[PDB]
Amino acid sequence: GKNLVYSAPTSAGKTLVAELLILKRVLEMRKKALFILPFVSVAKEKKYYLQSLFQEVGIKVDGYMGSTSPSRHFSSLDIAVCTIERANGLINRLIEENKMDLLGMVVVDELHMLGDSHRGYLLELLLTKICYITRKSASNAVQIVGMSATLPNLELVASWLNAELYHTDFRPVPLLESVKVDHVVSLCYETICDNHSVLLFCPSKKWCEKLADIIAREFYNLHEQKELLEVMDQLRRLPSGLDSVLQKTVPWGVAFHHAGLTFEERDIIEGAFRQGLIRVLAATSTLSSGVNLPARRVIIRTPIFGGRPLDILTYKQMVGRAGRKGVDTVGESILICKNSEKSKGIALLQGSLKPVRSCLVTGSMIRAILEIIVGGVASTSQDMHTYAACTFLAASGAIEACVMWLLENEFIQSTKVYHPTHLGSATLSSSLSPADTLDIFADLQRAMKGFVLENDLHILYLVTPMFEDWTTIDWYRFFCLWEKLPTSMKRVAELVGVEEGFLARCVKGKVVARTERQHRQMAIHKRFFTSLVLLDLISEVPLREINQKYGCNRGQIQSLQQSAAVYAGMITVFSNRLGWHNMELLLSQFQKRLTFGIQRELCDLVRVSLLNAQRARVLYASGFHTVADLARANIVEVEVILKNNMRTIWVTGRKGLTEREAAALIVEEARMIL
Amino acid sequence: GKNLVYSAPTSAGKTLVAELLILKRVLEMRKKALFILPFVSVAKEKKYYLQSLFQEVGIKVDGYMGSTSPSRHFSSLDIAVCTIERANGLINRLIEENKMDLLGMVVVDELHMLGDSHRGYLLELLLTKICYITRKSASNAVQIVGMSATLPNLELVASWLNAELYHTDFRPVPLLESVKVDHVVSLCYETICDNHSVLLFCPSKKWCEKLADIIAREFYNLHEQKELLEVMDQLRRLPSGLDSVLQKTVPWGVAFHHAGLTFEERDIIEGAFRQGLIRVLAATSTLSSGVNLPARRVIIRTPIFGGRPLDILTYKQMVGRAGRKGVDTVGESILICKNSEKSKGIALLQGSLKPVRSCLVTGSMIRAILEIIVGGVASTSQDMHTYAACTFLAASGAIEACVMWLLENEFIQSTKVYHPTHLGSATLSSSLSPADTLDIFADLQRAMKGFVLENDLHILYLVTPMFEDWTTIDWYRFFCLWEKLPTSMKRVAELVGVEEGFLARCVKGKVVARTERQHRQMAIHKRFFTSLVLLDLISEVPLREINQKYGCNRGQIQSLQQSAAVYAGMITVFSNRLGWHNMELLLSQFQKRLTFGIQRELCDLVRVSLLNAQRARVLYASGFHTVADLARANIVEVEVILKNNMRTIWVTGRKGLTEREAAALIVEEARMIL
Numbered sequence A, B: 001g002k003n004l005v006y007s008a009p010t011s012a013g014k015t016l017v018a019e020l021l022i023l024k025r026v027l028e029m030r031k032k033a034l035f036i037l038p039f040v041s042v043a044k045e046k047k048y049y050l051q052s053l054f055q056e057v058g059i060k061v062d063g064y065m066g067s068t069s070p071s072r073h074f075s076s077l078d079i080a081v082c083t084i085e086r087a088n089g090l091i092n093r094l095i096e097e098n099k100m101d102l103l104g105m106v107v108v109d110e111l112h113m114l115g116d117s118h119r120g121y122l123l124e125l126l127l128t129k130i131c132y133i134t135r136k137s138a139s140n141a142v143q144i145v146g147m148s149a150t151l152p153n154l155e156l157v158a159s160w161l162n163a164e165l166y167h168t169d170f171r172p173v174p175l176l177e178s179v180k181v182d183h184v185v186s187l188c189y190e191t192i193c194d195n196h197s198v199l200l201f202c203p204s205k206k207w208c209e210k211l212a213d214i215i216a217r218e219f220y221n222l223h224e225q226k227e228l229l230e231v232m233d234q235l236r237r238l239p240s241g242l243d244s245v246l247q248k249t250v251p252w253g254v255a256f257h258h259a260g261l262t263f264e265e266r267d268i269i270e271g272a273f274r275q276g277l278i279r280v281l282a283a284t285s286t287l288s289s290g291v292n293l294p295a296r297r298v299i300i301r302t303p304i305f306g307g308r309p310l311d312i313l314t315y316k317q318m319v320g321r322a323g324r325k326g327v328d329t330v331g332e333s334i335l336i337c338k339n340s341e342k343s344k345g346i347a348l349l350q351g352s353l354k355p356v357r358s359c360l361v362t363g364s365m366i367r368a369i370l371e372i373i374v375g376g377v378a379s380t381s382q383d384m385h386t387y388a389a390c391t392f393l394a395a396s397g398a399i400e401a402c403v404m405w406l407l408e409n410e411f412i413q414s415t416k417v418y419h420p421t422h423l424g425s426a427t428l429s430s431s432l433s434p435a436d437t438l439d440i441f442a443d444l445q446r447a448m449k450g451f452v453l454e455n456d457l458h459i460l461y462l463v464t465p466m467f468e469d470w471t472t473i474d475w476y477r478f479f480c481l482w483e484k485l486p487t488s489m490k491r492v493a494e495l496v497g498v499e500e501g502f503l504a505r506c507v508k509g510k511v512v513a514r515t516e517r518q519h520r521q522m523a524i525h526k527r528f529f530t531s532l533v534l535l536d537l538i539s540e541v542p543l544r545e546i547n548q549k550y551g552c553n554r555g556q557i558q559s560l561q562q563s564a565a566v567y568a569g570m571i572t573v574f575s576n577r578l579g580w581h582n583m584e585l586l587l588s589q590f591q592k593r594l595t596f597g598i599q600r601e602l603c604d605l606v607r608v609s610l611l612n613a614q615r616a617r618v619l620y621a622s623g624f625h626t627v628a629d630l631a632r633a634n635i636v637e638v639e640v641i642l643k644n645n646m647r648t649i650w651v652t653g654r655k656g657l658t659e660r661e662a663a664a665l666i667v668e669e670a671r672m673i674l
């Protein structure tokens, strides 16, 4: 239990040691074990893998990722496969409840994210809290395991965590990088004829789509069917339907994969590629850091990604997907280059990834100081400097500035001992950034004075996150929708701050320059557009109808859905801790409605993990209005309902599931819930 | 199963035949059975009696009375002991759900209330619906039983109900009357010497307390202790404490009973009297129609009750309490008179009660027409006249006026067939009078545009009933409280319509004359005062603090509490049916908080019938925050918690309950709830 930090190339079973360590620790010490993954998709995949691997040893695995949380108390859990942000929140709650001793280990995957990133600083704060608590209160307290690619300063990380060091460059399928600069058709024919898959990485979504289209066209001109038809049918019966370009590309063993698709379409395509049904997959940079999707040959369109040379870490994790362990002998990663791009390509071929920074006046430092002070682990400046010493920044005088910032804004109170007042405790529990918590407090307080209960829009405006630009707003369509809005929605629009003058300015004149800090008035109108999108979402309108009405594709709609669900949960916890009972009561429902995009009636019916928003409606419209009512039903009835040996329905982390046993599992899990 | 209507003097076991019939029908047909009582106190007493009687025969008895409702679905019930209005609502819901065939019989007690009364018309419409649905679809489907005093037109009632007729004047303790030679002291001395109790009836509250005072003083000057001390201690530990006058009146076997007291104090006094602990009880007119409280000698202070001769029905039910069946030989009811009051006294001594009216443009007819049309039992004018014929008024052309009234106000839609739109269905389900439902709709709709969620005052203003004058508002104190009000409450005050000008007018100038219909603005300020009282009630402040702060006594506070609880439940059902999900969500909690006068935290902890608002807090402050937590606890722990072989705590329908075994039932019923 002396911690550990090791690195190794992916596609070499590098997580096996971690799984072994969690198994041994959980079985011996009978203590919990977090498993921090960077992204929600890989987190879900790991959660399902661990569930399958440990279901036979009486180990409960259920993670805190995305907008979801385990249906059972954390006490019952044995392994929690959470994400970075939600793992930080979990550790904050454990510290708050003075039950940190339940934790036995914190396994962190993809530790290289500690460096430059908007979520790495959360990992740094999490690990710093682990180290500080472990050292202040002691051999076998809390083990930390790390993972990453080749890290230039991996030994620095091990020293910071006071852990071992193991670095090895060994992969069963030795990769053969080769840059080369007619013959394209011959190359495609000879690559496909070898009975191996190909993974292309293109910079643009549109260019990925078009390149997949031309490859499918060339395969058609130069020209298993049953399994490909099965995949096509699976794609057909989805809420977003089937994409026409994807329709004409899929049945030729060619497809595309980008953030524009929906999570279900991406999952279907990834599964088809994994089984070999899809031979060529044109993905984007997002898939590079996504699920484990090995390919015999990887190809990179151009090092220019988004008007800039491709990142070295991104390129490394792209080439890491070249080679199948068990069935393939060697792997190839081609990077086509041009006369002008030859220098950039040669630069990318050589050189390892850059060293890991710390990303620590800065909001990260304000957050860390708030976490320690509110958690009751560093109340005096004498020891807070010790926490600073524990940070990765130290191991590689802003505290006084940050502590004043918290006293200036009434996050903490001085007495020289420091304490939180109400917003310090409510800000930490909600896992909201202290910078945005002031605006959230001001907006929620203003809402409770004049709330509009006519519709769901005023509640949506308060749970709409504007921390990132999910889509480029088409202001002409927004103005048309505005002039077509009801009076009930226009009341909330005027209440929040939306003005027809600004909309008119944007409709014809160019987007107003937000050169001044007082011009958060632009954020209000973007937030109202987003809240209208969310209202259409939770009103259970189809994704395509939203896309036509608003211009946001289905992938962006789903991303906004997840962001709004997480933000609604966070705001609900904030209101609960602040003692706003009516606001919390109104916001409590919206987290699940936004997670699934359903109506109030289906909220109870979606507690069954095996029930989409569309599958909840067809069962609800039939007459099953409750999970208990589901438990009392024959399998044949639900099967005929779903209809109105072929694997046609898709569910996350599925198996050889068709509509026959899908009905069987719906009732079986309904019984389990009761 | 041919219905029945019988009459007999009270104290003659008139309910024995009804109990026999309900037992027979429930055991044979295995169908439900309603037991309609006029008042909540007598309804509770009858519910407990039926529970004790039929627990051993596997018959579940649970009543819909007051602000309470059974914790189990009506399907599981075997007998429902409901009140007139809640039985009417129950039958309306059964008609709406097309399950009136579930009933087996409807036993009605105190049928004479059908005449002049504000609640008899509900009984009339209830029985009219029963007999109409019986005749339309077959006459042995739902047996009806009746009870009353000597009705001059009992045969007419039986003919209306097409039922049998039995009228007997039999009482084992015959009542005597003879004038024989302030001549009250010797009367009291000789009545108390022979070891008998006395029940005095007085026309007011203050004079009742004063007469109790003088009687106790005389007994003290002219002179079981353990049981009286037990009663005194029971009165001691109550939320309202012990009355400064009752404290010195009780030890001498003398007490008083009026609406000013709390329900618990009235229950304690009644129980003490029934056991013989209290030898003299000065009650008021309310006790006349209350629980069964026999007394050897009844006395009536004066026929003038509230500036008018005592009612004949009221006098008959007063003298009905003269004579104990089983221990007494004869009973007497003295009516002291004066030279001027001799004529009124002799007039009231002779003569039976007046004939029963029907109390049917009138709001009762609008309600009946709405009930039949919305229930789907009379949708065409051809049959609605059949319903009119089925009424008691017919058996002893306004429909067209009422039907237009409902169409004018959009309660129903004509097509010639009639249907409800949304307010017709929402008005019937909520059991709200259609006359007040328009104001309720207008007020709720206005609230959902500018709701104030800072506090509970805006929710309270919408669940505050102003159907009766519960107290005389002291406007100087109200203006002072207004001056000291926070800004958050003043915001809702201005939103609802409260004005400083009107309060200033009332503070100094005489009460403004509401001679015009547009002066419902006076009702707004009374409603706001009542809503402030309710806010302090649900904030869990003591009754005495509210009385000092507002001037309303504890009895009036409790009456307003029950009225507001019932109205909150009704408004919640109204909002649910109208599709106002946020309003319903906000109003859902408040019914229980008003029923018990507790905070949000104790709502789950009061699900145990053996937990007051003070006992919920005492257990809650200790650490029991849930019924499940209460179940998992040793009896001795809860016993010591309550303490911080003597019966000192009081619960409704109690037995020889001591604190030692009181904690035993708290955990026992806590387990039963789970």
Ligand SMILES: COc1cnc(C(F)F)cc1-c1cc(C#CC2(O)CCOCC2)ccc1C(=O)Nc1nnc(C#CC2CC2)s1
Pocket: A064, A066, A067, A068, A069, A074, A085, A086, A087, A088, A089, A090, A091, A093, A094, A429, A430, A431, A465, A467, A563, A565, A566, A567, A569, A570, A573, A591
């Ligand atoms: C209160 O916080 C949440 C509530 N609810 C949800 C859920 F409903 F979605 C998610 C969160 C959450 C969101 C982010 C975030 C984030 C962004 O990156 C994206 C969205 O916008 C802001 C930035 C980070 C952390 C949390 C969080 O606290 N998680 C936890 N839940 N239980 C816990 C426990 C426990 C006891 C065992 C000890 S810890």
Ligand SMILES: COc1cnc(C(F)F)cc1-c1cc(C#CC2(O)CCOCC2)ccc1C(=O)Nc1nnc(C#CC2CC2)s1
Pocket: B064, B066, B067, B068, B069, B074, B075, B085, B086, B087, B088, B089, B090, B091, B093, B094, B097, B429, B430, B431, B465, B467, B563, B565, B566, B567, B568, B569, B570, B573, B591
């Ligand atoms: C929806 O109506 C209520 C809701 N909730 C409460 C409770 F919470 F208090 C009480 C009522 C209620 C109040 C009055 C009244 C009255 C006033 O005299 C006093 C207050 O102000 C207006 C006049 C009259 C009737 C009802 C009522 O419908 N009862 C029922 N409940 N379940 C039922 C069923 C069923 C299925 C088996 C078939 S039927």
